[PDB]
Structure formats: C-alpha cells, structure tokens
C-alpha cells in the first residue's frame, strides 16, 4: 500500500512511496505539481523492493532518514540525503532482522523520543510478533504480542510510555509502564487508526468499507458509526491544520470524503483532486489545510467567503479573516443620478424632461416628447391614444385641408401640425431645417408631396457639410412608368443605403401604386413618423387595420414610444406593467403614471402598486427631501392621495372654563401656557415616554446643555430615545 | 464592471455569518469563536466594532437582522439546537443583551431568518431535521414574548429556506425551502388566508443535487417571480402565477462557470444582479443582458 509523506521539518519536501523511492523538492514555477509549482527529484532509491511497511524519524537531526522494512522481516534505516554529518552514522544503514519470519504491516514513530524503534509484524508461530528496538544513537527495547498478529500500532504521543497494541480482533491497551499491566477491548475495526491531535484522547479507525471512532476514556463501544462505502478504503487520517476535519480515501475512488467532526452531525465533504484515484494523500502539518495527492500515473495533485449588497449598488466581500468591498467600475445607479437631477418634477416645461433624464436614449426621449404634444393639446380625450382617435390619390400628384378633423388632430398630436387649422407645414420645415435633420425634413415634405423643395433642401444639406448631391440626382428620376429600366434597377439598388430614411423614401417613390405595405413594416424609423404617414395616405379600412397591428406589436414587445399610439388607459397599464418587465425603471413610470392620469386609471392596482414600491425604493435610499416631494405631487394631482390627519389632541379631562380656542399644555422650562405670541422656534415638543412637553427653544437649549427629562422628578428621556 | 478594494478588518475566527441593514449604518459578523460582533461604517466610511458577545457555547450557525421600521433587532442560530437573538442597549455604549430563546427544536438550526415586513413582526428557522417554524409577537413593545405561530414539517434535511418576497395584496403568503438530506429540493409552501394553514404549492423538480441555499431576488413588483438556487449547477428560474394558485415555471439561465457546488446564493437591492460563490473560491455575479439573458457579469477570485 503506497503512500505520499512529507518531511516533518521541511514543507517543501515531497516523497511518494513505491518500489522505487522518489524523493522532491517544491519550487516556485521536474514534476508540476500546480500550475505555478514545479517539484523537482532529489534523488531516487529502490533500496527495498517489494516493500511492505516505512515509517520517518522523530529528530531533524539526521534529515532525508525513512525507513526500508522489506517482506524478509530485515529492518533498514536508509537515509536519501546528501548524508555528510549525521548525527549517528553508526545507525545509517543499520541491518535489523527479527527472529522469526513475518511481513510488517505498518510503521510508527515514538514522538516524544527518536532513541526507540517499534513496529508490528506478521503473528508469529507461538510467539511475541510485536518486539520493538531501541533506535538509541543487537537487541531490542521491548517486545509484546505473543502469538498475535498486529495490523498496525503507535505511541501515543501524550506519554514516551503510552502505545496501542491491536490483537487479531482485539484492541490492547498496552502500557509501557507495566508490560503485565494492559486492557484489551474486542473489535472488528484494527486498520486505518488515525487520531485528532487537538483531540488526543480522540481515535478512529477505517475497515474496509465502514469507519468507527471510538473515545479512549469509553473505549467499551464505537461512538459513532461512518457511512458505508462499495469501495475499500484506502487511507484514514485526520487533518491536523483543520479542527475537528478528517480526511477518508477509499481504493479506486475519485472522490475523497472528509467529514467536519467538530460538532461534537457530522459535515462530509467531498474533494475531487482529479480524474483518476489517487492512492494516497498527505495533509501538511506546517501549511494550513494543504493535502497532496499521488495520481497513479506519477501525477502528484495538490489541493487546498461571504458575500451581501448595499442600498447605494455596492457589494460587501469576506474571506477568512479578511473583508472587500466592491464597487462599478446599474438601473439602481441610473434611477439614484436621475433623481440626483431632479427629474420629472417640471411642470412649466415638460419638454425639458428628457433632457434632464441626461443620457441617450431615444425611448425615453421619445417618451416626454409624446407627453409634451399631449400638454399642449390638453391646453381629457387626448390621453385615450390614437387607439380610440382612430375608432370613431390614385396617382403621386406633386405640387391639404381635405384631411379629417380628427386626422388632423392626430398629426398635430404627433408633432407634424401645430396649433389651428392651418395646414403648413413651414412651421416643421424650418425646424427640421435649424435642427440640421435635414434627411428627416426630406422624407417629411416626400410624405407632404414637395418635390422640388425637397431638392432644394438636399441640395442646401449638400451645401452644408457629395453623396447628397448624387442621391438627389437619383430623386430627379420621378417616374411612373410599368415597365420602368430606372424603376426595375434603382429600386432594387437603394438597398445599399446606410441612411434608412432615404431609402424609405426611395421605396415609396417607387412602391406600386397605393400599396404602401413596406411603409408600416420599417422598424428602423420613427414611429409617429410612420404613423403620420399612415393616417395622412392610407385609407380608413387600411389605417385602422395598421393602427390596430402596431399597437398589438407595440404591447407585445414593450417599447417606451407605443405609449404615444396606446395612450393613458388600460391598454397604457398593460404597456406600463410590459416596460417594467422589460427593464424594471420605477421612477420614470412612476412620474408617467402621474402625466394626467384619470381617477378610473389612478385606481389600477398595479399603478398603485407600481408608486408604491417606488415610495419604498426612495425611502431606502435616505434621500429625506425627495420622498416628500413626490407625497406632495401625489396630493396635488390626486386628492385621494391626501395624507391623515394623524395626530388629534383630545384625551384625558378635557374640562371648561378654559380653554384655548384645564389647559393642554404648560411649558416645563418656562411654566407658560403654549399658544402665546424662527417661527419653528415656538412651537411646542411633546414626549411619547416621558409623558411631558415644553417650548420647542427652551427644550432645545435645554437638551443641548441638559440630558435627563427636565419634567419634574422625571427620568425618561424625552428626546434622547431614537438617537437620530 | 467591479474593482475589488480590500476592506480592513481582521477576523481572529473564522467567519461563520454575516449580516446587514436596511440603511446599512452598521454590520453583524458571526466568528467562528462561538461570539458575535458588529462593525459599523462609520460617517467617513471606516468600519469600527463596537459590539461583542458570544451567543452559544456551539459556533455559529447564521445571523441576521430585521427590519430599521421597528427598532435594532438581531437574530442568530447555532449548532447548539438554540437561537439567541441579542438587543442592544446603549446606556454611552451600546450592550447587546438577549431578549429571548428559541431552543423549541432538539437539533441544529441549519437557518434563521425573518419574514417581510408588510404582515408584522415573524422570524422563523429551519431545522436540519426537515423542520420551519414561525414565532410571532403579541406585541413589538415586549421584546421577551414570541410565540411560534405554525410550524412546516419539509421530510427532508432543510438546508436554506425562503419567504415570499413580495409585498403585493395580490402576493399572498410562501415560502420556500431547500433540501440537503434523486428528489426535488424547493418547496414553495403558502399558508392560504382563508385556510390561514401553511400549505405547499409545488417542488422544484428540475433540480435532484443537494440544495445549499434558497433565496428570492428583490421584487420590486414585477409581474413574475425570480429566485436562485445553491447546487452543483448556478440555474436561473422563474415563477410566474397563473386552494393554491397555478404558475408558470420557466428557467432564466443556468451558468455553471465555478465548475462546483455553491455555498450560497446573493443579489442586489434593486434585484438587477444576483451574486453566487461557488465551491472554486470564486463568486460569479449574473446580469441579465438587454435581450433577457443572463450573464455573468462579475469574476472574483
Ligand atoms: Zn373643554
Ligand atoms: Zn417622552
Ligand atoms: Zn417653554
Ligand atoms: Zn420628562
């Protein structure tokens, strides 16, 4: 049975144990023991073929000694190292042979002095099978075990007296002080006896597959019985870096269990150091839980916190005796800056929202912007959508009114028409124009049929900052022919355009005629764009079957803009609870929840619900003056939303003939009666516990100087109770 | 998107719990040294302990603390069969005195923890033995008096337990707890309003490899459920509702990067990331990307 040891004064020695010895030294990075540890070979000796039993040396002094005890019985003491100086070369080599013929099991070190040697052997004939030598510095110290067979013993280390001597089927307390003086307890279980070093009083024992431990002190029966296992064991030992761990190796297994016996349940572990079962491992007695294994194929595998959150997005690290914290290099962070700009508290100008959201996104731009045309508009049915709005040329003719009054409120809704009946879109135009959008303002006069103050404004954005130009040149090409060489290339080739509006543009020049079925199922555009061009040129049947297929996408994905089409109702909690689900930002939808609801939609539970867990969020954040601010927008669009009257002074005598408007109060530190003419300053205090009260700037002052209930023959502190 | 910055505290046990706050002022450590101490961050940020004591004569086996609404409370479970949980006092330092027990279970308690907020005062535990139970006080102002409400017997060595996380009128009572003892580990229990008796809803059948922890990511009332489970395999699952009421299950994501079992599951406030350490010494933090995939977004060694 081979096994891995180390040198007992040196960690970076590691041997394993065959019929060649092979000795290492660990280096920083020849064997790779890890990825960055190369051992490399001392020495290699083959000194005992067909080797049974070894054992180490109790003394630095010599270093590199294991011992050599072959089948024969003969016992050797070789030493590996560079041996120039030792400190017995007299026992270097030492020939030690038993009497009588038998094999030996396992070899074991006295701890407490090196001038000894003890070892088990085979049972002899009809004679003493355990005799151990005195190691000193051709006879030997004392022998014992007349006619038995020992598996494997010890000296305690407690005692240099102190051994464990094991019978066939017995364990025999032997003691060195008197060899007539032992205890024998019968036992199945003689092999694997490994034993806590912190626990010394503590033994275990592993036969084959099943492991008993048992107390020296109850040493009657085993305190508790291990799981037991297909596989044979092939080692026990207990780790001594680790309280109350022991590690268990069984033959042919991959997987080493190791139970926490320190409860006294015990926790087993399971440690797989690699894909093939090694034989044996060591525990290092000087690293803190390091163990070694040996990989059959001359492999040697070596194997060896608390984590929480914080309200401002950070995370809290421990390891062992030591603790991280971590922090971003988040939507909790975005929604906590957004709140940091005072967000959504405009009233006056409602466009300035999106700007102060402050990062990008066209969603959330597109967002405010729906609202803002809906502000004006409503200066109720506005905020039902275009949903509701929307319930109730053969030829390309390019050179307004004709439009429907409900069409042209919803264009202006979407921004393209102002206020009033005036159909121009100059206004747009211009504003497109400074906005520097040019190839938006280009497909907007496409869409408001100006072909040539679309060239114009091309050729003015060409003027501004080459492609343009050649693109116009294509735009001169206004055919409508069927059988069209321009319209059978170029309506394939536009494809190639990065710009997506000029390539929409392209396709409805050169679509068919009123089958504007790629209009609607562009995704890259804007969508009141697209919606704009949608009312102004499809028909009733067409646009409301269009305008009902968005608004089902629209719901279905959750984007910020389809709440401009859906609009403030039902349909708009169900886009609302999709866009939390989609991302989970409160605060936005809070604030949009609050644009103008009405009292029906107000009452949606998962509006409710929504405002809520956004109250809870910003209390948690400790923002003290902003929880306030959004209590006060709570109130002042909605008066269900009116805080209770809370504190109501009528209790004890009440009584008559006095009163304000006996008495109520009196002030403790001044005896006058409060309400008489830092304004805060003259309030007056009243104590939950302390049962008393007194003026606000007397009570200060006198809590600032004092620190007990100034109420007379009082102790209870007033103020000093909640320890803001 | 994380840098680690070592935080100067020295442990002279081993770590056997940790626990935080709402406004996280200060935070509970539980040693290995069968004692407990608090270090609190200080107005500059320096975590200084002022508190220290040792709860049982066993070593550690969880601690947590409740909610800032109702005072300091804080809580803790041993291997001793018994839960402490010490209150300040601050006559001027602050002295953590216990103000009651919790030793009704003749084993181990494997966890301890409270319930939301929303429904009152109610801390339970889970037992090794496949044992919960819920006390709940009389009255907040009586720090001594907790009577246990109802107790859940899960058959199976309870290892982690959790409660229903939401604070929806709709959201009624659950909890879930995991196993340790090829079967189901999670057990989602409700106690129903009109039975007012905790009853089970559903085992988590998708997983049979031992249960180490069992938690419910922030809810911040979305309209599906989300919770983690501590196994060989990190997977991502979620609940969505459709006696006890129906539900949709479907799994989020399951990364499995530590190549190990964890120790125990962890997330974020807002519930955006959902942090896990596994058994290679390694915790692996998961965001969720803009097309709702999770992905682990942090790497810590
Ligand atoms: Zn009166
Ligand atoms: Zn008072
Ligand atoms: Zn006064
Ligand atoms: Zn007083």
């Known amino acids: ?724 | 998107m994380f840098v680690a910055r070592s935080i100067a505290a020295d442990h002279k046990d081993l770590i056997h719990d940790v626990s935080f706050d709402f406004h996280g002022r200060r935070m509970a450590t539980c040693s290995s040294d069968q004692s407990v101490k608090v270090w609190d961050k200080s107005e500059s940020g320096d975590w200084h302990c002022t508190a220290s004591w040792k709860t049982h004569s066993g070593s550690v086996w969880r601690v947590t603390w409740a909610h800032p609404e109702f005072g300091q409370v804080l809580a803790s479970c041993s291997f001793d069969r018994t839960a402490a949980v010490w209150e300040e006092i601050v006559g001027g330092q602050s002295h953590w005195v216990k103000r009651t027990t919790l030793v009704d279970s003749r084993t181990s308690v494997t966890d301890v923890k409270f319930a939301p907020k929303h429904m009152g005062l109610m801390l339970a535990t889970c037992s090794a033995d496949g044992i919960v139970r819920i006390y709940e006080a009389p009255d907040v102002m009586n720090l001594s008096q907790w009577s246990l409400q109802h107790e859940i017997s899960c058959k199976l060595s309870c290892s982690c337990i959790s409660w229903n996380p939401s604070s929806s009128r709709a959201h009624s009572p659950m909890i879930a707890v995991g196993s340790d003892d090829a079967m189901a580990k999670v057990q989602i229990f409700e106690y129903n309003e009109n039975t007012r008796k905790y009853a089970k809803a559903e085992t988590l059948m998708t997983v049979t490899d031992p249960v180490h922890d069992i938690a419910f990511a922030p809810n911040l009332g979305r309209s599906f459920h989300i919770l983690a489970i501590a196994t060989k395999d990190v997977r991502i699952f979620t609940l969505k509702p459709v006696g006890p009421t129906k539900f949709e299950i479907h799994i989020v994501a399951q990364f499995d990067n530590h190549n190990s079992q964890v120790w125990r599951v962890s997330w974020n406030i807002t519930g955006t990331v959902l942090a896990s350490s596994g058994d290679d010494g390694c915790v692996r933090l998961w965001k969720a990307n803009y097309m709702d995939n999770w992905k682990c977004t942090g790497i810590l060694k």
């Not at chain 1, 019985?73 to 038998?102: C, M």
């Not at chain 1, 905020?383 to 390019?398: D, L």
């Open chain 1, 1 to 724: 049975k081979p096994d891995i040891l180390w040198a007992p004064h040196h960690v970076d020695r590691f041997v394993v144990c065959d019929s060649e010895l092979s000795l290492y030294h660990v280096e920083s990075t020849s064997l790779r023991l890890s990825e960055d540890s190369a051992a490399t070979l001392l020495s290699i000796n083959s000194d005992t073929p067909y080797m049974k039993c070894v054992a180490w040396y109790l003394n630095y002094d010599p270093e590199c000694l294991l011992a050599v005890g072959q089948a024969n019985g003969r016992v050797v003491l070789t030493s590996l190292g560079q041996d120039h100086n030792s400190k017995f070369k007299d026992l270097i080599g030492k020939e030690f042979v038993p009497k009588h013929a038998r094999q030996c099991n396992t070899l074991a070190w006295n701890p407490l002095d090196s001038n000894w040697l003890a070892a088990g052997l085979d049972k002899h004939r009809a004679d003493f099978s355990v005799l151990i030598w005195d190691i000193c510095s051709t006879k030997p110290l004392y022998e014992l075990g007349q006619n038995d067979a020992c598996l494997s013993l010890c000296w305690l280390p407690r005692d240099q007296k102190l051994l464990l001597a094991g019978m066939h089927r017995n364990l025999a307390i032997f003691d060195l002080r008197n060899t007539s003086q032992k205890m024998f307890v019968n036992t199945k279980a003689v092999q694997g006896v490994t034993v806590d070093p912190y626990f010394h009083d503590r033994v275990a024992s592993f036969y084959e597959g099943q492991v008993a431990i048992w107390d020296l002190r109850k040493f009657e029966k085993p305190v508790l019985t291990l799981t037991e296992q297909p596989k044979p064991l092939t080692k026990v030992a207990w780790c001594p870096t680790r309280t109350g761990l022991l590690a268990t190796l069984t033959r042919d297994s991959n997987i080493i269990r190791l139970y926490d016996m320190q409860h006294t349940t015990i926790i087993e572990r399971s440690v797989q150091p690699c894909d093939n079962y090694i034989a044996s491992f060591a525990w290092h007695p000087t690293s803190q839980n390091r163990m070694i294994v040996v990989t059959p194929n001359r492999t040697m595998s070596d194997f060896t916190i608390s984590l929480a959150w914080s309200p401002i997005t950070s995370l809290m690290w421990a390891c062992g005796r030591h603790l991280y914290e971590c922090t971003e290099e988040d939507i909790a962070t975005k929604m906590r800056l957004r709140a940091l700009s005072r967000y959504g508290l405009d009233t006056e100008q409602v466009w300035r929202n999106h700007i102060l959201a402050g990062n990008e996104d066209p969603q959330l731009k597109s967002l405010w912007y729906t609202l803002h045309f809906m502000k004006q508009y409503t200066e109720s049915l506005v905020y039902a959508g275009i949903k509701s709005i929307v319930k109730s040329s053969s030829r390309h003719n390019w050179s307004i009114q004709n439009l429907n009054e409900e069409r042209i409120l919803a264009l202006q809704l979407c921004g393209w028409i102002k206020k009033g009946t005036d159909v121009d879109v100059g206004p747009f135009l211009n504003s497109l124009v400074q906005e520097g959008e040019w190839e938006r303002a280009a497909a907007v006069a496409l869409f408001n049929l100006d072909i040539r103050r679309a060239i114009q404004i091309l050729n003015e954005g060409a003027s501004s900052e080459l492609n343009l130009n050649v693109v116009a040149m294509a735009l001169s090409g206004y055919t409508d022919e069927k059988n069209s060489l321009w319209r059978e290339m170029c309506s394939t080739l536009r494809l190639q355009l990065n710009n997506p509006y000029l390539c929409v543009m392209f396709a409805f020049l050169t679509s068919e005629t009123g089958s504007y079925d790629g209009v609607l199922y562009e995704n890259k555009v804007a969508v009141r764009d697209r919606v704009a061009f949608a009312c102004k040129f499809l028909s009733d049947t067409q646009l409301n079957r269009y305008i009902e297929k968005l608004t089902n996408e629209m719901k279905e994905a959750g984007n910020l803009e389809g709440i401009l089409l859906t609009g403030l109702t039902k349909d708009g909690v169900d886009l609302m609870e999709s866009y939390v689900d989609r991302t989970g930002d409160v605060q936005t939808a809070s604030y949009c929840m609050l644009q103008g609801s009405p009292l029906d939609v107000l009452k949606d539970e998962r509006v409710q619900y929504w405002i809520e867990n956004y109250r809870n969020l910003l209390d948690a954040w400790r923002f003290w003056h902003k929880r306030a601010e959004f209590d006060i927008h709570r109130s002042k669009l909605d008066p269900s939303s009116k805080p209770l009257a809370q504190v109501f002074v009528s209790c004890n005598f009440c009584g008559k003939s006095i009163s304000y408007s006996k008495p109520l109060p009196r002030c403790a530190l001044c005896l006058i009666n409060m309400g008489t003419p830092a304004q805060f300053n003259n309030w007056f205090t009243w104590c939950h516990n302390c049962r008393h009260g007194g003026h606000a700037g007397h009570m200060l002052s006198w809590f600032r100087d004092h620190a007990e209930c100034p109420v007379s023959a009082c102790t209870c502190k007033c103020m000093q109770l909640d320890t803001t």
